[PDB]
Design an enzyme around this catalytic site. Structure first.
Site, PDB file in Angstrom:
ATOM      1  N   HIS A  63       0.808  -1.225   0.000  1.00  0.00           N
ATOM      2  CA  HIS A  63       0.000   0.000   0.000  1.00  0.00           C
ATOM      3  C   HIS A  63       0.855   1.297   0.000  1.00  0.00           C
ATOM      4  O   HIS A  63       0.291   2.391  -0.052  1.00  0.00           O
ATOM      5  CB  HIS A  63      -1.087   0.007   1.097  1.00  0.00           C
ATOM      6  N   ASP A  89       0.396  -7.937   1.936  1.00  0.00           N
ATOM      7  CA  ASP A  89       0.818  -6.536   1.859  1.00  0.00           C
ATOM      8  C   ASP A  89       2.343  -6.435   1.790  1.00  0.00           C
ATOM      9  O   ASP A  89       3.000  -6.091   2.776  1.00  0.00           O
ATOM     10  CB  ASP A  89       0.217  -5.738   3.040  1.00  0.00           C
ATOM     11  N   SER A 128       4.414   2.377   7.981  1.00  0.00           N
ATOM     12  CA  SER A 128       4.079   1.295   7.046  1.00  0.00           C
ATOM     13  C   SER A 128       5.220   0.876   6.143  1.00  0.00           C
ATOM     14  O   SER A 128       5.936   1.728   5.624  1.00  0.00           O
ATOM     15  CB  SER A 128       2.853   1.635   6.217  1.00  0.00           C
ATOM     16  N   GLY A 129       5.410  -0.431   6.011  1.00  0.00           N
ATOM     17  CA  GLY A 129       6.493  -0.989   5.210  1.00  0.00           C
ATOM     18  C   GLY A 129       7.798  -1.124   5.968  1.00  0.00           C
ATOM     19  O   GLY A 129       8.737  -1.753   5.476  1.00  0.00           O
ATOM     20  N   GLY A 183       2.777   6.229   8.552  1.00  0.00           N
ATOM     21  CA  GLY A 183       4.124   6.723   8.293  1.00  0.00           C
ATOM     22  C   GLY A 183       5.175   5.651   8.505  1.00  0.00           C
ATOM     23  O   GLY A 183       6.236   5.689   7.874  1.00  0.00           O
TER      24      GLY A 183
END
Ligand code: J2Q
Length: 222
Positions: free
Chosen positions: A41, A85, A176-177, A174
């Protein structure tokens, strides 16, 4: 990241900062000089990857910047549910390794025994602001059964749950990943969770990295 504190300057050489339109968007993990792992995402136009960063507000001698030449989203990623994801980014300029730029090895064993875990990132803090200095927090893996009770019908085998009973230390928008590190190995990627952020009851949900060994290796070698 909520209820944490500033990271030790030398503790996060694998951490990537992902930017779009000159603003921080996501976290990422350096896993090979040419590749960064992040959440699917986090796909936005013209991603700029910054390695060797600690403080986003200052120019640092250790920082290395690269555009992305290839973005590979998992074929079975489902945006509505956050299932699978995961996304691999191929760097235009391979990472010049240093003490502050190093890849993190992946956890390949889904039945890996309990090790000390931590999260990190430049995501939303407790005050609701976005920090210049990278935040860190120790968290623990939450059983699949307790996570299923927290999010009925939403937790797949491609997800892991982790949090903190004491202060609700958790990742946020912020982050994420960004990495969930367990025993010096990449165990997870920040994906989704409680809004507002806090893990006392509803744990943070992470992409279960161990499930993607073959796909990651196949993509890198392609
Ligand atoms: C591409 C930019 O990414 C984002 C955009 C808008 C929202 C989010 C977000 O809310 N993420 C998130 C929520 C909870 C937790 C958690 N409590 N563990 C972690 C991450 C986002 O990542």
């Amino acid at each position: 990241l909520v209820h944490g504190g500033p990271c030790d300057k030398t503790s996060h050489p694998y951490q990537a900062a992902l930017y779009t339109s000159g603003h921080l968007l996501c976290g990422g993990v350096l896993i090979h000089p040419l590749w960064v792992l992040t959440a699917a995402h986090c796909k936005k136009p013209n991603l700029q990857v910054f390695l060797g960063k600690h403080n986003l507000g200052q120019q640092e001698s250790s920082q290395e910047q690269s555009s992305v030449v290839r973005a590979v989203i998992h074929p079975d990623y489902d945006a509505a549910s956050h299932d699978q994801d995961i996304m691999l980014l191929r760097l235009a300029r391979p990472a010049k390794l240093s003490e502050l730029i190093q890849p993190l090895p992946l956890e390949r064993d889904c039945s890996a025994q309990t090790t000390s875990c931590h999260i990190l990132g430049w995501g939303k803090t407790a005050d609701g602001d976005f920090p210049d200095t990278i935040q860190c927090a120790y968290i623990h893996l939450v059983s699949r059964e307790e996570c299923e009770h927290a999010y009925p019908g939403q937790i797949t085998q491609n997800m892991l749950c982790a949090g903190d009973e004491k202060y609700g230390k958790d990742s946020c928008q912020g982050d994420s990943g960004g990495p969930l590190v367990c025993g010096d190995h990449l165990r997870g990627l920040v994906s989704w969770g409680n809004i507002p952020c806090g893990s006392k009851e509803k744990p943070g949900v992470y992409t279960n990295v161990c499930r993607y060994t073959n796909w990651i290796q196949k993509t890198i070698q392609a």
